Amino acid sequence: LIIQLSSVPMLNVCFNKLFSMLQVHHVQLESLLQLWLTLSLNSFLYNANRIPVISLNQASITSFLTVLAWYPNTLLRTWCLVLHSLTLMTNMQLNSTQESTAHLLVSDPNLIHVLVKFLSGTSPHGTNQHSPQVGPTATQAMQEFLTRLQVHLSSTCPQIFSEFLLKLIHILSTERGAFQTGQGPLDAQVKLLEFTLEQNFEVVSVSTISAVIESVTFLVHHYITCSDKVMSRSGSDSSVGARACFGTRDQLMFDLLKLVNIL
């Protein structure tokens, strides 16, 4: 009988208007992300394989990454929303033979800053004591985001993703980095390192490899040399000491050294 148009064109236009409006402080990041996530999953969970119903423009993604980059401080809920949104946008296909959305995200320099901010900073510290961790849910979200990025870029050029990952590790491990100062969420960093050990680094640049190796070696030398002079472990814990050869920040240092062995 009568044929009714779909609501997706004008709704895409509206969302693209909203995302381009972020930088001028007219809309809120968290509410917009929640609304887009809710409205883009109508065809029930946060499955990483679902294709978003809404489609954002390249400029929308660029503005979103920028506003994330300079954003003053993010709560954990905001970071989980950001990770879920990026995971969904990875599945999203740009339309305005174009480069993949994952390719645009990886080639964007602001993604490095966003990930470094997530893995280095924490929630702003009030009087109430909070664990220096991020929780299982946000860790799983970050792992899913990285897995989607790897899956989408494997068919075209894994080298750029591997170089991205190595640059991220180098920036984290450099002077005044999160790894050196032991600031960010330990579980998130450990899982990021765990995800790194299964890559290939097939066509990565050798200068990046040299920088990563130098940073990791210097960090591990500092960690070994400047270990604390007091040990107080719970009865349940039976982990061997760092300077104990031939037998949880140690798991981070050991994972970094396992990466250097791969490189």
Partner: peptide, 20 residues
């Protein structure tokens, strides 16, 4: 359908209540 209900300015105002 949502297109048959509102036009572009009305939809933009409606979403601005949630996020604006």
């Amino acid at each position: 359908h949502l297109c048959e209900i509102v036009n572009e300015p009305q939809l933009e105002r409606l979403l601005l209540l949630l996020v604006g």
